[PDB]
Design a protein around this ligand. Structure first.
Ligand code: ADP
Ligand code: ADP
Ligand code: BEF
Ligand code: BEF
Ligand code: MG
Ligand code: MG
Lengths: 49, 417, 417
């Protein structure tokens, strides 16, 4: 839970930023997937007039 | 690309930029729609975006980074950030953030921040180690904000007169008591120009609440810095939104050891707005005003203070009287003595069409020996004793003549000796 | 055939035209039904139609082109256009369009547009390249709209007095504060006649909201141009419909670099209408008025501005006071200082039955040195100083006598020197 670190910018900052970006993108993609699944399963279906 | 360079340019610049980007006829859409389309076209070439926005949070958990183009409202240009970033980098409302952002990705519709670069013009290190606003200790002002320009033009009078009428200090709680159509607009224009010329270090802030668009554009092209405004094209929702946005921005700045000076006009309209939005708690008093509805304006006037270690938050708000609205009357009554600086303008002198129109005996500052030096204070005492027996129109003409033969205040001082 | 030539003719003309067309007895149907039948009979001979209508869109997607015969309401004469044309030619509400139309074909019931010819009296080329209204920059008025006719008849007084009481400029935000039965009807008649005589280039627009049909017909036969009206034969729905129609028409015109001058009467009735249509948001204040219900009138008064590159939108709206309705009181209170031009009429002077009845000390214009020249402004200052000490009835009689011995304002000016 404490990914926040930093020292020796030139390469460590770049790599840590890339990995944090990958992590947040994965989290956002999975949240989008979950929200899409929720909207799909909660969408009421038509039955008859 | 950077978002601010799309911010500072007018609409025709966006038109020619979109024409450079080979875009459809874009004269029909909003400026923010044009900026969105141009940023999408730029990122389609495999480019990242650089943005800057003031942060705002709802109970929904996630945050929105607004720009000053819409005076901090929702729009296609604002950036969406997850609550995770707010939890990590210790973000909060009013914290202006600048950094890398990307256009909305597959299924998204607003921008998203990638990497923070400047948190209130500061690295995240000391931004996370920020002292809390209400946890601070208020003080009084010794740093005197000199209102005199020194050039001594035709209008500089209205500034230099304050140097002998109402001293201004950092973090002062000032309120203007004035009837409509008296000269407050040009007055605040003068004060903004003077503080920017004499003190360019302190970030300037002006509050245009419930005003006409002509005044909006005239003040956004005359103040010597970034400004915010709000007309009556939207209901009190926009007004309360911009009030919270500006108050949290000023709070975060003064927490970052900044010197903020907000100019609010007019405060009665803010009170009307806060009344209109807040539901009735079941008790109303005379004037059709709810009891605890004024709590938000109260707070907004109480945010002014003087930080001990460094920084200050001065608030100079104008109030409307003599409008005939008894509601407004009661409002001013609630604002009887909440501030330590009073600027009283009277319609009687302004009807004689001389400017400015100062109520010297009615205006003043509480605990003013802590602002200026001893000789200046003694000369202020002498001037007050000389101006008390005479009336107001004759006194105003006397002051105007005395400050018309002379330019700096030392000449008038020695002439009064 | 053209639709406008069926527009400008009275009912008896349509009767004889239908008799020429060998039609059944048509005295029973509406004028629009007669026009529909005549157009069907004309197209049955293998003919096309030429029409002109102001465009309006609902959420349904497609658009309707209304005429001024029904003051822009639904009818058998309005033209139906598909959303495809709106998407292609970049159409929007208020955009008056003239071109080829056909009667409703098999299964259809309203007219359909074939080929656009004039988009707001302009080719589609520059009509698609239209600057957005809210994206513009407001300004102030230097072009002085001279209200003096120069003929100097018996009633021209009420116009020339404004030349010394309330200067009029292009894009001015003007509001009249007047009790009922004081002389506002003839006042706006005079102002319309004067602006049409002195400035025939600017398109005239007059708003008759919630009025009696006699006033409707008297103003539709006295204004020097096209007019719109709305009586109380329908609920507030028609009122809000015509308000949106006229505001979008004026917006599209001023976007086409036009000079629009709208005369609204009365604005309190528009506020009542907007209150009646808009549902309650759960919060009501004193007067039985919703909080954010006044947002639409606010906006309508805020639409007035001055375009930088060219064109202007002046709005002169009348408000009703002294009616005893506290609701109305609160309404005027909301309209305390939203406009930069006030025309105050008092019942006390009108009870002495002299016309006009100007409240000189209460009326005025903010930032008026930018409208007229320097000598005219100095003479206005002199007249204001001369009229301030005296009362109102004596001052009105004095002004009437002084402008009765003389005809043009230069004579009164030099006589005041
Ligand atoms: N110090 C001044 N110097 C020159 N003109 C002034 C001065 N003060 C006021 N005026 C004039 O008086 C008018 C003030 O009107 P306005 O500013 O709209 O009212 P308010 O003072 O309530 O904002 C302006 O047109 C301005 O030209
Ligand atoms: N310039 C004028 N000359 C003569 N009579 C006038 C003049 N202006 C107003 N009046 C009188 O005042 C009355 C105004 O009537 P009305 O139009 O109902 O007032 P309002 O416009 O306030 O509704 C008219 O009956 C008319 O006789
Ligand atoms: F700007 Be004025 F005081 F209405
Ligand atoms: F036209 Be009246 F003043 F009702
Ligand atoms: Mg003002
Ligand atoms: Mg009338």
């Amino acid at each position: 839970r404490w990914l926040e670190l930093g020292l020796t910018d030139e390469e460590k900052q770049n790599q840590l930023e890339q990995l944090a970006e990958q992590y947040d993108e994965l989290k956002h993609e999975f949240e989008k997937k979950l929200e899409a699944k929720r909207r799909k399963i909660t969408q009421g279906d038509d039955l008859a007039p | 690309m950077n978002l601010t360079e799309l911010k500072n340019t007018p609409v025709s610049e966006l038109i020619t930029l979109g024409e450079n980007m080979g875009l459809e006829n874009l004269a029909r859409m909003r400026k923010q729609d044009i900026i969105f389309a141009i940023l999408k076209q730029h990122a389609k070439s495999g480019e990242d975006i650089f943005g800057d926005g003031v942060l705002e949070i709802l109970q929904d958990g996630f945050g929105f980074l607004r720009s000053a183009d819409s005076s901090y409202l929702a729009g296609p240009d604002d950036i969406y950030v997850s609550p995770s970033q707010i939890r990590r980098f210790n973000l909060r409302t009013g914290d202006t953030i600048s950094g890398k952002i990307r256009p909305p990705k597959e299924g998204e519709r607003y921008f998203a921040l990638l990497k923070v670069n400047e948190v209130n013009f500061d690295k995240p290190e000391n931004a996370r180690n920020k002292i809390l606003f209400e946890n601070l200790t208020p003080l009084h002002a010794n740093s005197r904000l000199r209102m005199e320009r020194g050039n001594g033009s035709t209008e500089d009078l209205t500034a230099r007169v304050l140097d002998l009428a109402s001293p201004i200090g950092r973090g002062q709680r000032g309120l203007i008591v004035a009837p409509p159509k008296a000269g407050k607009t040009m007055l605040l224009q003068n004060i903004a120009q003077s503080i920017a010329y004499n003190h360019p270090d302190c970030v300037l802030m002006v509050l245009l609440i419930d005003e006409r668009p002509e005044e909006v554009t005239e003040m956004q092209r005359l103040v010597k810095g970034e400004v915010v405004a709000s007309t009556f094209d939207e209901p009190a929702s926009r007004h309360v939104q911009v009030a919270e946005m500006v108050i949290e921005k000023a709070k975060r700045l003064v927490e970052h050891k900044k010197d903020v000076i907000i100019l609010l006009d007019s405060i009665t309209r803010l009170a009307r707005a806060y009344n209109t939005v807040v539901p009735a708690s079941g008790k109303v008093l005379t004037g059709g005003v709810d009891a605890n509805a004024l709590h938000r304006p109260k707070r907004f006037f109480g945010a002014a203070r003087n930080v001990e270690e460094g920084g200050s938050l001065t608030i100079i708000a104008t109030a409307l009287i003599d409008t005939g609205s008894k509601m407004d009357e009661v409002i001013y009554e609630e604002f009887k003595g909440t501030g330590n600086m009073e600027l009283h303008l009277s319609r009687k002198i302004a009807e004689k069409r001389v400017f400015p129109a100062i109520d010297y005996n009615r205006s003043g500052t509480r605990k003013e020996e802590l602002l200026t030096t001893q000789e200046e204070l003694q000369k202020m005492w002498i001037l007050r004793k000389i101006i008390h027996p005479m009336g107001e129109i004759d006194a105003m003409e006397f002051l105007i003549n005395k400050l018309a033969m002379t330019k700096t205040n030392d000449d008038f001082f020695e002439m009064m000796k």
